[PDB]
């Protein structure tokens with residue numbers, strides 16, 4: 001009952017009553033050998049890294065300043081949606097009841113089934129291991145938008161990564177007090193003595209992997225995987241799934257959006273948010289190096305945004321994270337030079353390749369290696385240019401190290417969002433940029449998002465939230481629409497972008513990268529009320545010569561902004577059937593109305 005004798009750091013007595021209960025009740029259940037209450041200190045961090053190094057769990061990267069490499073079990077390398085569930089009394093609160101097929105907008109599990117699953121996994125699960133108690137805040141410590149969690153885990157890798165990806169340690173505990181917190185429980189599911197072989201010194205249990213959310217109990221319970229999205233419970237589980245439910249209840253928004261600040265040559269600054277599918281491109285835009293002279297781009301965050309209208313009706317956003325857990329492959333000086341600078345210090349890498357001189361390597365890194373330098377792949381074999389890095393391999397780096405981190409990125413009141421950008425991977429039919437005709441149309445544009453996966457398949461990913469909805473997507477849509485009836489709400493301009501448009505030959509029509517600053521300039525000007533737009537059936541596009549195309553030469557703007565009736569007829573039809581099937585009885589009136597209006601404008605082409 002009393003686990004005081006097994007505490008190796010901190011004190012049960014010093015914790016708040018409800019934090020003590022959570023820790024102890026789970027210590028009784030999981031049966032850890034020790035309990036380690038994290039203080040978040042450098043001493044704690046450095047010593048835990050050194051200990052993972054002793055046990056072959058991580059390798060130090062001698063080329064850089066305090067960087068580390070973990071290579072995982074090939075079976076445990078990404079989020080598993082088919083094993084990710086939300087528990088509520090009624091299925092319909094978690095997912096809309098689909099008309100004809102299976103739901104693509106979430107996975108419900110009953111309380112009864114979950115309790116059985118829990119009981120078959122967690123008892124004894126931490127035997128012989130340390131239970132780490134991680135107090136963490138999501139958002140700047142003083143922010144009224146910030147929310148506090150306690151994560152218990154038996155993985156040192158999760159602890160170190162949480163120190164980066166959240167604000168972690170003693171000060172969180174002192175701030176929390178007798179307040180409320182999200183209860184976060186995680187185990188890798190490998191009690192000692194090990195029943196099964198350990199692969200690549202990476203403890204996991206694929207067969208029993210389960211990532212569960214119980215919003216009504218304020219608990220996140222995750223078993224069997226050590227990989228980021230499944231084990232860093234503050235991130236997807238808390239900051240999108242639980243938080244989007246809380247957001248709905250409390251009248252704010254929790255979204256899968258990057259946040260950047262952009263300043264023009266006359267000193268005026270605006271903040272924008274953007275939701276793109278997990279098929280990334282977010283971190284690139286969030287850290288964009290703008291080519292346009294006199295423009296500046298600074299990063300507030302690259303993944304998640306918690307947004308709330310303030311008393312003045314401004315939509316205020318914070319980044320609830322403390323770091324960047326970005327996709328490593330494809331990251332280069334060319335694609336994201338700001339990312340390269342960030343990750344050369346104090347960064348934990350996972351499943352990337354290692355050079356013989358202790359550097360990192362991945363596909364699309366585009367840095368020649370000196371003759372003499374050989375490469376060891378993420379699978380721990382020598383490698384010759386099978387990919388040297390796993391395609392979902394990662395870097396985990398502090399946000400404060402980004403050389404263009406926004407000076408207001410930790411401001412407790414957040415930053416005012418004046419524009420919201422949706423977008424996706426569309427080779428055909430969708431213009432480079434357009435602007436929604438209204439808030440209601442803008443919500444429909446988010447609802448309608450489609451993107452080509454990596455023959456090709458084009459999938460729906462509404463609001464970039466398909467894997468992340470905390471609750472019924474229809475009600476989520478209703479929640480977005482309600483904002484139009486909030487008292488002083490200054491509703492931001494909604495835009496949609498497609499970097500991926502190809503010509504007949506399969507070649508990109510837009511150069512992208514830092515040239516995307518040119519599209520951001522147009523957005524900026526439209527927010528200022530400029531007359532730079534032309535009306536089309538799908539929304540406003542830049543009118544003749546509105547974009548700055550100087551220094552690019554002859555970009556084919558006709559094709560790049562071409563809108564075909566036959567394509568868009570097909571598009572609205574496909575969207576109609578998707579919303580009817582997947583949202584069904586929960587599709588709000590106003591979304592059906594936007595659908596009809598779009599169909600109608602197209603038919604008149």
Ligand SMILES: O=C(O)c1cccnc1C(=O)O
Nearest residue numbers: 079228229236278303325326
């Ligand atoms: O869980 C992930 O893989 C993940 C990790 C970091 C940022 N985004 C994602 C995502 O899928 O959107």
Ligand SMILES: [Mn+2]
Nearest residue numbers: 256278303304
């Ligand atoms: Mn993401």
Ligand SMILES: [Mn+2]
Nearest residue numbers: 481484485590
């Ligand atoms: Mn309305």
Ligand code: NA
Nearest residue numbers: 057071200201
């Ligand atoms: Na390993």
